[PDB]
Structures are given as C-alpha cells and as structure tokens.
Amino acid sequence: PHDPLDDIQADPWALWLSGYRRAAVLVALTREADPRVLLTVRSKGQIAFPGGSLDAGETPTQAALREAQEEVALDPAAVTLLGELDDVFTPVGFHVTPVLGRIAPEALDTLRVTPEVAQIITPTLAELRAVPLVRERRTLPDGTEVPLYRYPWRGLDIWGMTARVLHDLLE
Ligand SMILES: [Mg+2]
C-alpha cells in the first residue's frame, strides 16, 4: 500500500532533526568486523531503510520488523533488537523511530526484493564514515539552524531523513 512516509521522505525540502504522525524504520547492522547497514533503493530511486507508518495499535518495533519482512523478506526472528536511536522528525508532522537490530551477515544473502524495492544496498559503516560527507544547514521558521546531511556512496546519493538517521547511527 501507499505510505505517507514515502511521500515526505521524497520531499527535498522537508527538514529532519532529532531533539504527530508516527512511523518507524529498521536499521539492521550485520554482526561482523566491518558492519554493513541494510538499505534499499525504491522502485534515481529513493534510498531508504525498510520502514513505514505504524498501523493502529502497532508499536515502532513491530512496524519496523513487519516492514523489513514485507519489503525484503527479512525474517524478524533473524533480528536481535538493539534498542532505538533518537526519533528524527520533520516540522510538517512526522515522527520516525529508528529501530536498531543486528543480523548475521549471511542473512543478507537470501533476502528477496518485493515490487516496492528495486535493489538492496549494504554500505559498510567504515565506507559511510570515509565518503566525502555533505554538510549543509537550513533554518526553520523559528530561526533555529538545522544540519542537513548527504552521503555520496558509490554513485548513489543518500540524503534527507535516511542520511540524518545514518549520521546519528555513525555518531
Ligand atoms: Mg509499507
């Protein structure tokens, strides 16, 4: 189904920060030396973590796991929940809970893309830390400055909410 989260996520001018519509994304890291992060390229495609809006009566963790399973067939039982990062949000009215999880590196080998996902990409955390990070800043209506990030990885452009979550994960 269509999710408002995907609309706001593609809004080039929607600002994301951390500090009424609720959503969650799964931030799965492989259990290895140089951890890889599970990311998707939606059917240039929108780069995002598996995720979506919470259904009624559903928690952030349940949503994140369901979305990863619906999108790339990631079995929730393959995920060890590590807790969550701080919520990231945008003025318009979206609160996103990044749910952290750890999976075996092998788990990636058998994931299966569904129609809404074009490909699965797995940047290594080392790589994302080494890429020439783009740091811009915009000001909100209240006059508050806010940092914007963009990770130029292998020709792809990871930006917006996803990059904000990524940067927080890296810090
Ligand atoms: Mg969905």
Side-chain angles (χ1 to χ4, degrees), residues 2-150:
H2 165 280
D3 194 315
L5 180 69
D6 297 321
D7 286 323
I8 184 72
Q9 251 199 298
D11 185 356
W13 321 107
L15 302 184
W16 296 91
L17 54 167
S18 50
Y20 270 72
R21 279 179 294 182
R22 299 173 66 212
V25 295
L26 182 62
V27 182
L29 287 28
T30 58
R31 189 176 298 96
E32 60 184 310
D34 190 20
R36 281 175 287 168
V37 63
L38 175 58
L39 281 168
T40 66
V41 171
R42 300 309 175 74
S43 52
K44 301 176 180 182
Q46 162 82 49
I47 298 178
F49 288 107
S53 299
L54 313 191
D55 287 331
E58 183 182 53
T59 65
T61 303
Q62 301 180 321
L65 294 171
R66 167 180 58 72
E67 277 297 342
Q69 182 171 47
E70 293 181 353
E71 295 181 32
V72 295
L74 175 65
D75 177 12
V79 188
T80 292
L81 302 169
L82 305 177
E84 27 272 300
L85 295 172
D86 289 313
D87 283 6
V88 297
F89 56 90
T90 179
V92 59
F94 248 103
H95 246 267
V96 186
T97 295
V99 180
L100 297 160
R102 193 169 294 286
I103 63 179
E106 312 75 37
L108 301 173
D109 300 355
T110 52
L111 292 181
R112 181 174 290 274
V113 136
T114 47
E116 72 183 302
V117 175
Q119 71 178 286
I120 293 170
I121 54 167
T122 61
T124 224
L125 298 191
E127 295 170 344
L128 296 176
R129 291 194 166 101
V131 162
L133 180 72
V134 176
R135 306 178 206 106
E136 294 189 65
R137 188 163 307 150
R138 267 120 196 63
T139 304
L140 286 48
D142 70 307
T144 280
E145 287 161 285
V146 162
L148 292 201
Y149 303 100
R150 281 173 46 203

